[PDB]
Amino acid sequence: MSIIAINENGFLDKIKGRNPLFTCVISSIETTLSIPISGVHRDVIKYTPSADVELVFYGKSLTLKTPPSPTPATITRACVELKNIKNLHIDAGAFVKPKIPFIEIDEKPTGRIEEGKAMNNSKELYMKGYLLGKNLDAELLIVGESVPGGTTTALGVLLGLGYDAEGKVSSGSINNPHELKIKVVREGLKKAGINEKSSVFDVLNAVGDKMMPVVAGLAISFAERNKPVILAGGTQMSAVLAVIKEINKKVLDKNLIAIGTTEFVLNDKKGDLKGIVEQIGNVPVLASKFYFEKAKIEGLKNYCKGSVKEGVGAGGIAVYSIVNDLEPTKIREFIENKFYEWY
Amino acid sequence: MSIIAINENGFLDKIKGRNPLFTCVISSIETTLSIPISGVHRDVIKYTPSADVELVFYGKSLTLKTPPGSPTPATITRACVELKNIKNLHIDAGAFVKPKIPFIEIDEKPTGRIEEGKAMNNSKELYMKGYLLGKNLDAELLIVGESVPGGTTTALGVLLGLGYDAEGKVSSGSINNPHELKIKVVREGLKKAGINEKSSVFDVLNAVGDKMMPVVAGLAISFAERNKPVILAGGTQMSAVLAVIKEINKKVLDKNLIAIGTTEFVLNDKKGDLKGIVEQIGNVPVLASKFYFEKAKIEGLKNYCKGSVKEGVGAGGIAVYSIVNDLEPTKIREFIENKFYEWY
Ligand SMILES: Cc1cc2ncn([C@H]3O[C@H](COP(=O)(O)O)[C@@H](O)[C@H]3O)c2cc1C
Ligand SMILES: O=C(O)c1ccc[n+]([C@@H]2O[C@H](COP(=O)([O-])O)[C@@H](O)[C@H]2O)c1
Ligand SMILES: O=C(O)c1cccnc1
């Protein structure tokens, strides 16, 4: 098969033939404007998350001339079309808003991580995600993210919750500035005073990003109804998985929540995803194989060398798509064919 | 029993059992900040739509200290979501003040000045967005309402611009129904915009429509294309929407999946003629919910029997679904009296 399943625990059977809703949660981080923590090029980073979800929902970016080595939203759009997957998208603080219809949970971007001032309202954000979740329906929730800099806020949250994660976080590019990232989050974990006294929300408030409580609410509201949730992302979704255990360890016991990502994230050298998960729980981690070795866009080959890797729920929706008899090469063909248009 | 049906045509069974999505589309009109076309108090008109959908989704209003002079019909909508656990997501298409609850933002800019013929310039694009959003919503039945202060005026202008006999037929928010101020406004606007019979539905919407109209059109046509039923939960405003649905896609109408769902207070409004608008449009089920509000225990609710508020926020349409699916009508009225002091 083209699906690496670690701690599968029956899950892939849970999502076979089930009707999905896909949703991507986007956010922007103040720090990224002046500190190069993110692998998203600075000329497009204010526009990248919205252009991502526009490409998924509508088939064309509008906030940019082209989409953002192409954006992983290319893979997410591939699966949306190739398997006709309904998708709605959520804003929790992107600098520039989507010109497609979208759900507005929070207009204000994630603040400056290095100051312990990520956000003053992570619990409110959590409740909005759960309430929003209560009013969505499907047999399965595939929930992704588009947060430039999200691997840095993922580091702080994991660390702030007492996990061992240095060097373990991934990145949206080949280079992975782990030292800058550690320096950034440590400064704000300290300015905000996070210790082992602190709640999950104290930590999110210091160094998290606003996508995280929202996706936490969504996931728990869906798992509580014994509906499976595919946390579609890499490193970042292990921070959310962690946050979900600090919020309701009970539902996590239910076995209804799996991380779904790409081969390029599972098999990433400059990080260690399964190591972080291990410290959290016996949770299914599922990577999807895309065979971009045999590609015809050298932008797509570049995924095999650490360019991009993941994002916009690409890996987890591919997992879903592939479990439901999608030929994994179609993804590569789709992007291949649509490429000249988009760019 | 508790449901009056014009040309029911079997629609009632098509909706029994099926599980619904309720969505309210809100908007605001610049014209209501200067001209008294609307029955909403001027002091809270800028803040009403947002507060209405707050009440319905979250159980209480946040932009105002209390829900929106009589009591807003969101209480009716609110009541029904809790009693039949109707899932609900709400849509903004130009309200002055955005809601504090999670909402789908389609257009932040309000509806323009009706009298100048400058309601909007993106009606076709708003319809394409409502349609594409429809595609990505899943339910067995869509119940789509609205909350647009001044919306009976834009409904009149749209109906008149499309060649209908609609004067004196639109209903109103409060007991008073300034029909001729309404007519001067939209006729002024139609003239400035140059609408005549060669104009398109979108030219008309851009002259004197409101932005919720084409969004609801898109939502309704997408669900009905997929053979799902659709309740347009509104009064005369939804007859304007119904007219719009017919210009855009006549044949979907002919699939008998789209009905209007309103209150008894609208269908029995002598200061209006909902029935008469719709028979010029086509043979479409018109369904109204009986509330038995004279047995009411708060005069504000009771005030409905005399023409205050009447309808709004999918209240009539959401009740039709909640009654067709075996909810006892009085539970609505006894719900709103139990919490009247919490809200107020
Ligand atoms: C062009 C491009 C578009 C993307 N959209 C999402 N991601 C992905 O990379 C980001 C996280 O990595 P970091 O911590 O380096 O910001 C997220 O936005 C994730 O969705 C992208 C990555 C790239 C290169
Ligand atoms: O469409 C109708 O027939 C109708 C009848 C009574 C009340 N309404 C509600 O009141 C507003 C429209 O009425 P008006 O008088 O402000 O044009 C808007 O908020 C609607 O939800 C609408
Ligand atoms: O592991 C992640 O979360 C990740 C890696 C690369 C790009 N975006 C996200």
Author numbering:
A (entry chain B): 1 to 68, 74 to 348
B (entry chain A): 1 to 68, 73 to 348
From the paper:
Cobamides (Cbas) are coenzymes used by cells across all domains of life, but de novo synthesis is only found in some bacteria and archaea. Base activation is catalyzed by a phosphoribosyltransferase (PRTase). To gain insights into the mechanism of base activation by the PRTase from Methanocaldococcus jannaschii (MjCobT), we solved crystal structures of the enzyme in complex with substrate and products. The protein fold consists of an eight-stranded mostly parallel β-sheet with connecting α-helices on both sides where the substrate binding pocket is built from the connecting loops and resides at the end of the C-terminal end of β-strands.
MjCobT was crystallized in the presence of DMB at pH 7.0 and gave a crystal lattice that contained two protein subunits per asymmetric units. These crystals were soaked in 1 mM NaMN and a nucleotide base overnight prior to freezing. During that time the enzyme catalyzed a transferase reaction. The contents of the two active sites are different. One subunit contains NaMN, whereas the second includes α-RP and nicotinic acid. This provides an opportunity to observe substrate and product in the same crystal lattice. NaMN lies at the base of the active site for chain A where there are extensive hydrogen bonding interactions with the phosphoryl moiety, and specific interactions with the ribose 2′ and 3′-oxygens and the carboxylate group of NaMN. The coordination of the ribose, phosphate, and nicotinic acid moieties in the active site that complexed α-RP is very similar to what was observed for NaMN. However, there are additional hydrogen bonds between O2’ of the ribose and Oγ1 and Oγ2 of Glu 150. There is a hydrogen bond between an imidazole nitrogen of DMB and Oγ of Asp 52 that fulfills the hydrogen bonding potential of the benzimidazole ring.
